[PDB]
């Protein structure tokens, strides 16, 4: 029974591998050789946000490119004003162990989650003046790794029980469940059109899901160790990942394989976060060796370094107008670069 | 429209910062601990002496303590174990013993000790079931740990009254297994405090209090470059 099933799985794997092999016409580096290099990129710290008592685990930029939320170990959730460095809100959490936070695309809400297996949604439009828990979504059987709003009533979570889900915040139930991975899921990224999303798990693989169908579309399995970060290309046709083997990679949805690899022999630390530029020419990655690296996405050449943190870099994001980069770290500081 | 809203921003920032200074005052006066150990070890009775994660509050001599027990998670520790990298101490509970359980206990201790983000945490080690060990020995360790036949009780052993050395040798053998794993590495940056507890005991909180006091004293000595 299991013998012929394993044989047929191996046969299908070989058929898929040969199908991809018959498609590698020419390497991406072979095509972008004549393109003039970007040149050195210098970025300076413009702001420094100083209010967290302990490590910082996550952050998210508002769609207005001005405000941002951040989470920390002390049990706080602080909303900043990056232009003027003024704290707007500071929400105290019931559980001190939070691993993620998201900021709604409309600006009316903010989410968080962590080791308590629960996603809490906070209503910022305080009719009476105070911020209070709108909804507590409890259906997972493992910690929460990431969460991203679709709109004011839908949110996608990824968990440490090898499962992602889609929620109806009004009812508090699970609309759909995405069950393909065989390890903890550590990140997710929503498409520009928000009809698909990709996840990264602790089995060195990534998958492409259909939010409305509820099924896996494609699987990308280049990496060697656990995947920690994931992000789409601005086009929506490619994405980049970052894993524990001190490497980043670029995958394409239409060719169904890998295109580029961003690594060096002197880099032996894992990547904690990736992000793209507004045009998709830069690729920013934060490492465990206390600093960030800027990559030329088309030629795989380093273009700069963002070294301003004393402990490891845990999160990284780029505004929606592409004007600034915010970097959080375990030394309890955020820094805006430009 | 401009200056008045700037004033409002500054007022909100000031109020937030005042609440944050009060919170910071509260946050530094509490010591957080992580309680580990397998199910058969006997963590439940230890907790009763004092959902993805649990929590217990107790204070000794007007000093506040937190203790966190992992609830409904999976058996893959390599990811959620990094959240506990700046707790005061880890309390590792072991039962003196169906496969080889002591080897899994020793392997988990070795993994915790050498982890990159847990190289500054000290472990308060409880060797729990000292009565089951008393009966089992006087009724085998050589067939799972073949170094036992060449083990002799340390000179500085403290035997309980009315106890035959037959169990004292096994007690100190297991303690020395954990302690010899401990000193193989660590650069002297963290320490292990092993204790021989029992199923029922009235002084586990006192032992944890003394061990945490020593841990914090050594940490302060080390942060002034005096150690």
């Amino acid at each position, epitope marked *: 029974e299991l013998d012929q099933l*394993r044989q047929e799985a191996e046969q299908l794997k070989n058929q898929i591998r040969d199908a991809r092999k018959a498609c590698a016409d020419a390497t991406l580096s072979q095509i972008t050789n004549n393109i003039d290099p970007v040149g050195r990129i210098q970025m300076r710290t413009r702001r420094t946000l100083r209010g967290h008592l302990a490590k910082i685990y996550a952050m998210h930029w508002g769609t207005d490119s001005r405000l941002l939320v951040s989470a920390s170990q002390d049990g706080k959730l602080i909303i900043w004003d990056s232009y003027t460095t003024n704290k707007v809100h500071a929400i105290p959490l019931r559980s001190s162990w939070v691993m993620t936070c998201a900021y709604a695309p409309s600006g009316n809400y903010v989410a968080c989650g962590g080791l308590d297996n629960i996603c809490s949604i906070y209503n910022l439009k305080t009719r009476e003046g105070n911020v209070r828990v709108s909804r507590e979504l409890a259906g997972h059987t493992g910690y929460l790794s990431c969460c991203r709003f679709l709109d004011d009533n839908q949110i996608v979570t990824s968990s440490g029980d090898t499962t992602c889900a889609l929620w109806d915040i009004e009812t508090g139930q699970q609309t759909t469940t995405f069950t393909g991975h*065989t*390890g903890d899921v550590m990140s997710l990224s929503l498409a520009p059109d928000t009809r698909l999303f990709v996840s990264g798990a*602790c*089995d*060195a693989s990534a998958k492409l899901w259909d939010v409305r169908e509820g099924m896996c579309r494609q699987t990308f*399995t*280049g990496h*060697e*160790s*656990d995947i920690n970060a994931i992000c789409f290309f601005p086009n929506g046709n490619a994405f980049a990942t970052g894993s*524990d*083997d*001190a490497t980043c990679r670029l995958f394409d949805l239409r060719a169904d394989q890998e295109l580029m690899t961003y690594s060096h022999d002197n880099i*032996i630390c*894992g990547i904690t976060s990736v992000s793209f530029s507004k045009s998709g020419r830069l690729l920013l990655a934060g490492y465990d060796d206390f600093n960030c690296n800027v990559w030329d996405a088309l030629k795989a050449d380093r273009a700069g370094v963002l070294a301003g943190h004393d402990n490891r870099v845990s999160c990284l994001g780029v505004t929606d107008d592409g004007m600034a980069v915010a970097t959080g770290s375990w030394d309890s500081f955020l820094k805006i670069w430009n | 429209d401009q200056r008045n809203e700037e004033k409002a921003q500054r007022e909100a920032n000031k109020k937030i910062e005042k609440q944050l200074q009060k919170d910071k005052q509260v946050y530094r006066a509490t010591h957080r601990l992580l309680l580990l150990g397998a199910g058969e070890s006997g963590k439940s009775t230890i907790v009763k002496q004092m959902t993805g994660i649990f929590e217990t509050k107790f204070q000794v001599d007007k000093v506040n303590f937190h203790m966190f027990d992992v609830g409904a998670q999976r*058996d*893959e*520790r*390599r990811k959620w*174990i990094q959240c506990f990298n700046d707790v005061t101490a880890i309390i590792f509970v072991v039962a003196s013993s169906q*496969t*080889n359980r002591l*080897q*899994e206990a020793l*392997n988990l201790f*070795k*993994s915790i000790w*050498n*982890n*990159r983000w847990l190289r500054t945490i000290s472990v308060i080690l409880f060797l729990n079931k000292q009565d089951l060990l008393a009966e089992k020995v006087l009724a085998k360790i050589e*067939d*799972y*740990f*073949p*170094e036992f036949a060449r083990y002799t009780t340390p000179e500085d052993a403290t035997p309980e009254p009315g106890e035959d050395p037959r169990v004292t040798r096994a007690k100190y053998f297991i303690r020395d297994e954990f302690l010899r794993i401990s000193t193989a*590495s660590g650069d002297g940056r963290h320490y292990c405090y092993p204790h021989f507890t029992c199923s029922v005991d009235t002084e586990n909180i006192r032992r944890v209090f003394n061990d945490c006091r020593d841990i914090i004293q050594r940490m302060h000595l080390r942060q002034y470059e005096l150690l």
Partner: nanobody
Amino acid sequence: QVQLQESGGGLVQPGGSLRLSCAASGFTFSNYKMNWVRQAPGKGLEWVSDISQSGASISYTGSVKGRFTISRDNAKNTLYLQMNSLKPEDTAVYYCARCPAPFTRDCFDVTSTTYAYRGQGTQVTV
């Protein structure tokens, strides 16, 4: 893609010998510490031995120490185990498990019910 494939095993007489092999693909064999784990009938998985990146540090379980040997070939990308002077209680399925991350000295989840970086196992019977 990470793939570990065990070979060797079968039925041997008590007091006999065996030699397992595990061929690794999809990663650099030279950056990872390698393990061997086993699962007896009706029981859970149990760690058996491991070998360092270079091949210097080696450890064994108490019950197999003296008989079993673990060795690796970084050039040929293969992991070995020599199981001589067997006993009936040594019947189980043996897996080669790799530590999750490179350049590390700890290995957490090799002896776990659903681990992503080990093979399918070879039945060894006595």
